[PDB]
Amino acid sequence: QCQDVVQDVPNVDVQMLELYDRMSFKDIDGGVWKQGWNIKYDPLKYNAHHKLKVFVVPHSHNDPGWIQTFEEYYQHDTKHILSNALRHLHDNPEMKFIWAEISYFARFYHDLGENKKLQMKSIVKNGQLEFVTGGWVMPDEANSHWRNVLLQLTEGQTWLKQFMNVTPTASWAIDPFGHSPTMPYILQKSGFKNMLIQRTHYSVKKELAQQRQLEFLWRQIWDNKGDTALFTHMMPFYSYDIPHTCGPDPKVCCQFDFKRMGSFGLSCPWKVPPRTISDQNVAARSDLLVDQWKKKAELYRTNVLLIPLGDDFRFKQNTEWDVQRVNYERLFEHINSQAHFNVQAQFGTLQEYFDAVHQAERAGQAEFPTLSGDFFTYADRSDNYWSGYYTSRPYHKRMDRVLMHYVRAAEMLSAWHSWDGMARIEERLEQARRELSLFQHHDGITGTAKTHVVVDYEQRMQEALKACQMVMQQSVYRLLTKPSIYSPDFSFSYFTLDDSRWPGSGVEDSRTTIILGEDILPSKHVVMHNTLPHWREQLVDFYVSSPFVSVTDLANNPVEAQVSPVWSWHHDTLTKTIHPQGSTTKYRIIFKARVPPMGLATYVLTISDSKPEHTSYASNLLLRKNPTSLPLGQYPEDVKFGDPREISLRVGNGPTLAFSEQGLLKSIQLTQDSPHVPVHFKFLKYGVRSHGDRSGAYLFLPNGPASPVELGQPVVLVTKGKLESSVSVGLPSVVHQTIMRGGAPEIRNLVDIGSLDNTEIVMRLETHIDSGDIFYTDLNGLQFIKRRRLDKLPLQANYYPIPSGMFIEDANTRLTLLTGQPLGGSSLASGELEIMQDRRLASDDERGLGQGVLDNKPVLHIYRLVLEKVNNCVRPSKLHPAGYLTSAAHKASQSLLDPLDKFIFAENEWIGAQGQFGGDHPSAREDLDVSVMRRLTKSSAKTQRVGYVLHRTNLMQCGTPEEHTQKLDVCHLLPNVARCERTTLTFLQNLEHLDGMVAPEVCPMETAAYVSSHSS
Ligand SMILES: *[C@@H]1O[C@H](CO)[C@@H](O)[C@H](O)[C@H]1NC(C)=O
Ligand SMILES: O[C@@H]1[C@H](O)C[S@@+]2CCCC[C@@H]12
Ligand SMILES: [Zn+2]
Secondary structure, three states: OOOOOOOOOOOOOEEHHHHHHHOOOOOOOOOOOOOOOOOOOOHHHOEOOEOEEEEEEEEEEOOOOOOOOHHHHHHHHHHHHHHHHHHHHHHOOOOOEEEOOHHHHHHHHOOOOHHHHHHHHHHHHOOOEEEOOOOOOOEOOOOOOHHHHHHHHHHHHHHHHHHOOOOOOEEEEOOOOOEOOHHHHHHHOOOOOEEEEOOOOHHHHHHHHHOOOOEEEEOOOOOOOOOOOEEEEEOOOOOOOHHHOOOOOHHHHHHHOOOOOOOOOOOOOOOOOOOOOOOOOHHHHHHHHHHHHHHHHOOOOOOEEEEEEEEEOOOOOHHHHHHHHHHHHHHHHHHHHOHHHOEEEEEOOHHHHHHHHHHHHHOOOOOOOEEEOOEOOOEOOOOOEOOHHHOOOHHHHHHHHHHHHHHHHHHHHHHOOOOOHHHOHHHHHHHHHHHHHHHOEOOOOOOOOOHHHHHHHHHHHHHHHHHHHHHHHHHHHHHOEOOOOOOOOOOOOOEEEOOOOOOOOOOOOOOOEEOOEOOOEOEEEEEEEEOOOOOEEEEEEEEEOOOOEEEEEOOOOEEOEEEEEEEEEEEEOOOOEEEEEEEEEEEEEEEEEEEOOOEEEEEEEEEOOOOOOOEEEOEEEEEOOOOOOOOOOOOOOOOEEEOOOOEEEEOOOOOEEEEOOOOOEEEEEOOOOOOOEEEEEEEEEEOOOOOOOOOOOOOOOOOOOOEEOOOOOOOEEEEEOOOOEEEEEEEOOEEEEEEEOOOOOEEEEEEOOOOOOOEEEEEEEEEOOOOOOEEEEEEOOOEEEEEEOOOOOOHHHHOEEEOOEEEEEOOOEEEEEEEOOOEEEEOOOOOEEEEEEEEEEOOOOOOOOOOOEOOOOOEEEEEEEEEEEOOOOOOOOOOOOEEOOOHHHHHHHHHHHOOOEEEEEOOOOOOOEOOEEOOOOOOOOOOEEEEEEEEOOOOOOOEEEEEEEEEEOOOOOOOOOOOOOOOOOHHHOOOOEEEEEEEOOOOOOEEEEOHHHOOOOOOOOOEEEEEEEEEO
16 A cells, blocks of 8 residues: 555665665876767767757856846846847747746846737747756755745745646756655656756766766655655766856866856866857867767667756856857757767757657667666765865854744734735745745855855845744734624734744844733733644743743643743853852743644743742852852842852653763663763864865865864853753853753754854764664654765865754664754764854855855754664664654654744733634644645635645654544535645646545655635
8 A cells, every 4th residue: 555665665766875885985187078088989889860959048048146146136137038038039930048047037027018028928838948856945955844845845836837827847056965765756746757966976977977866766764665766867078157067078068068168257167168159160160079879869768858057147248149059050050960979959949859769768779777876975076075165154044944934934824814915925925935945055055155145035025024923913803703793904913923042042032021920911912723634731930030931821720830040141241250140130931732733832921929839930040160149030030159060960750861061961761760971062163174175165074083172161051940941051152052851952052153263063962872883864844864984085075954853772772863953974893973053264165156154143053863773673774765753752843843933912901802712623753744834816706716735754763652633524524515625836737636625645655735625
């Protein structure tokens, strides 16, 4: 029924971890093809019965922000390229052009008059202008979450279907810095038939070219059957520019980039400029170019050859369109008319190329290899590994994950109703989706844009967060107010959001204190939202003006709560310590919220004059030599002081954690009877090389293994409470906090690298787990892939993306670190895990950015740390390329990426308030998520439609019976259902009309989309 994703190792032609194990990686000079070899061909391979069919595919790589902002590029470059594309294609019917970035195409199209819109649709209809991929952007594939990869794909393709009436089935990804199999996973479930990639390690390109394995059916690592497989073309050479696209010799290919003769600035660095093609030289030029094409064709299996023709922000000047087009037309005319070449060459599009390849395949002329695995970590040359951008600009990496969740919550909360146009819900959600989609660009989330461009992306994401807040709080007001009493002003703030972890404590003082008093306002309603489709309990905290506060639920049942001081840390440059101060004016109340699946739950905070019956107070202990007092206003318990010492803590039934005298974890004891397992946090720094190649925003080029941060005698703050305890320490550049609520701890790091030029700060965990050279990291928050540390590769090559988690295990024990933000990381030695916190780099790394990374700001990084016995778990065999999380680790990841949302009622009194929403929603099996809920129609449509994306992970069976559980049928979540369809993941094509209007659940590791239709 469902394929087993654990126990059957797929049999594939190329399995990338296996290939890595066997391959050499020596960087030897291949000749004119620097990283390959001198390609030879048999001139008699091609003849009158067997011609080489060559498709020259004009293109223009438009970065939505990099050296300039989106809007600066649009004004200076892209509006011209697209205006001239329209003119030239229209006037030249055989000319073709491919277009990837829909964010720019949409920006342009809505500035066009109707006549030009009509002309534009005509060049799309007739195939001359062809969209490739059709995403809002060409996303990063390392740091991006799969949910946002799908978001930005859907944003661009919904635009194309509405305005152009097209949906691309061929994808073009020429610039992301290394490639992820999450792309064919999403694309193949979104109707795609083919895809193309470019930036893979030069040794891999050489290895696959030698075997003609550059075109392959790329399946997921756990896919035994092959149903996930998507035909993929990997380009063979160092760049997608013209010098590295016509064949192996860039000195020759540069002469066929006709923008490089002088009048455009540009030139050929190999010293031979292009010449205008004339009757006098066409035969000689043709002979040179065809010889390049024939050599490139030797690396592939069919007689159909792809020759991209383009570069960054190309096809801008009218004169550039003419000079490319006319010169190639003369080449084509001569080549195609000379039989001795046995070539037929023409401008083509990407789809035209793939269609012709598969016609060749179907004719029996080639069969393709199967492949699984990924293409990280990329190197473009020598030891230049692009692992730096797994961490660059980590404030915005964390902001990506915050905005991902607020997009989801805002679309889901507002989906339950149709809204009047005057509410502007659709407006706000479209802006939020588009600013988040823009940030998925491979210069956005990657942290590889110029300083002012990163500022542009940040301001855009702040506006998106505000839009999501506006929508969420209007929605909560409606969902929780008796229908006959509900009286909305759509511009008013009924609730403010309270978020404990963004921008985070010591990043921005942004949270509102709930002000209560016996003489003023005795109580306050707070509301929690749970986006996940199962009942959820989680501790939530709020700031309040009195410690004397108790909590009740909708039915006035008392709820156990804990009050703690509000602690902030300060780099005290009188005493030269980093140390905490307690607030004397506000306090934190903490309690367990229990919230329906995809639902809401309301609680009340009420002040009293003295300690309430159901509220406890944390003790606090400051460990430092030479202490001074720490007053806390009305807080009832005096802080205690002690010299630095080892301490140990236990919340609830959960683990016991032991801490060193510098306030870092040293051990974890799972059960009262079990061993204290050594687990040691440590902070270290990497430097930059003085001589030769420098780290910058892309490249990680450390000057040797990391050295320990010298900690001195740090101040340690210990807070012990019934519900929540912690240990926090002020270390140089990092306030490090371990938080305990009774299961796996939460780690928070407030990271301020300050003015530490040329430093990368890393957090390492040291254990006795005998992991050897193996470790696991995730790809896009979707799947965990086995990594093997290789000593044949330098340190920076053994760094991988950690977009949401990493783990190490042996026969008996696993340690999993789950993240709230994508960062770079590795396991550099047996029993270790490490993940980079921030990097500040005073040199440029010579990729075109023209600056280092000197714009660091304080960022709050969050994690969960899960130590587990796994000898009872059913794991994949030794040769399997995947790993899987346990239930606890998967729940821990969900607690970071999609926590409960908190709302504080903004006025004194909420008339018509209700206690709960969604108590009748089905509570689905823990491995199932409703990744997206989105209403797809505006309020005037007779037939309302709501789309759902359902994702089932695969969790290890470790012998918890864990039973129960209602079937989730998303099609019956809203009333008056009339149809239920399974669709592509973008919602743009119906794939199956479903019996009884019931949406089935999906298999482990599968993602499906459903659209329910409702008469209204
Ligand atoms: C939309 O797509 C297809 C093109 O193959 C066509 O059948 C349909 O008429 C199109 N609608 C138009 C022309 O807007
Ligand atoms: O970040 C840039 C940008 O996306 C265009 S491309 C230019 C070379 C360096 C990597 C890529
Ligand atoms: Zn780019």
